Amino acid sequence: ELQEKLIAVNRVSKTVKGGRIFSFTALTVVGDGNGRVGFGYGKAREVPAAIQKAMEKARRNMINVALNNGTLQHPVKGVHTGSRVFMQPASEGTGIIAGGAMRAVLEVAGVHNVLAKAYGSTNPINVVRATIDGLENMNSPEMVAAKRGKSVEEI
Amino acid sequence: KIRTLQGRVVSDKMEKSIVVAIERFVKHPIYGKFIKRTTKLHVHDENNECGIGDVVEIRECRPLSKTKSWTLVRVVEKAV
């Protein structure tokens, strides 16, 4: 039932006496379709070993986001290295309109209706990093009520 | 129904006229800062009772000269 998505595969290279050593990298996300999302990143000489190492990482290192009927609480900004990220809770019917890197994160997360956009570097590893943290710092109508010490209508 | 303006006297030199400045704050259309704007009006002062620096209440009336379409209603504060 966990949902897992392959976001990007890439070839890097290391140089030695004999020449270049080629390897691969894999960036993935797993999610429970109901408010939990992890991302993983693995390296290996062959692609399958890399796509597999990443899922393994993605399964742990997983976090919770305070969803709201399949959509977000409030607009949110996320940032990590080059990537400035922005997300909005859209009305019902829209679905996920977003770049590939973000769509995969939001899909597996369970965010059903959102407007998203990535600014600056669309480098996938940092875009997803920035989205996860955005969702993670996203606070909930109940916690702000708890924080402020009042269960007014706003609860 | 007495529409009116309030401002201060920047020039009282002219015979039976005065220059009044109306200042107001306005939101900047693009950058949101509140900016001072001034509107200078040539106003009629029969009897020349308005001194420079005075704060005066003025009203709009028919043309009195090429540039005067306002006249004095009364002085509010004077000689700061």
Partner: protein, 123 residues
């Protein structure tokens, strides 16, 4: 940065400079062939590329590519030019429209004919 600063000097978008000024926002332009010659291209390529110098109806004089294999063009040939640079030919920023005005179509083309001014062969 300051709001105050922008209030004194607004954001001012840069005006895009064109890559085909001789066209003056026209889709093609007409012109007479001034010189018709070949030239060699830039690193790492190597060839004898067909180009022509063309004086346009608006006075501009530019160099234009003559694409395709084979052409029957010479001085005083009246041709039609369109936008489109030739990358390994610096200075060359226009293409000649094969099969318009005095410029003939490419001989014996079967694929991509319309980009080389070639009628559909009876068959």
């Amino acid at each position: 940065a300051t709001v105050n600063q922008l209030v004194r000097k607004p954001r001012a978008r840069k005006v895009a400079k064109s890559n085909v000024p001789a066209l003056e926002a026209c889709p093609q332009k007409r012109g007479v062939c001034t010189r018709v010659y070949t030239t060699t291209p830039k690193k790492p390529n190597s060839a004898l590329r067909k180009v022509c110098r063309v004086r346009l109806t608006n006075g501009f004089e530019v160099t234009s590519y003559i694409g395709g294999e084979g052409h029957n063009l010479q001085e005083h040939s009246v041709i039609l030019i369109r936008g489109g640079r030739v990358k390994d030919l610096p200075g060359v920023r226009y293409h000649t429209v094969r099969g318009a005005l005095d410029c003939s179509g490419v001989k014996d083309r079967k694929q991509a004919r319309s980009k080389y001014g070639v009628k559909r062969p009876k068959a």
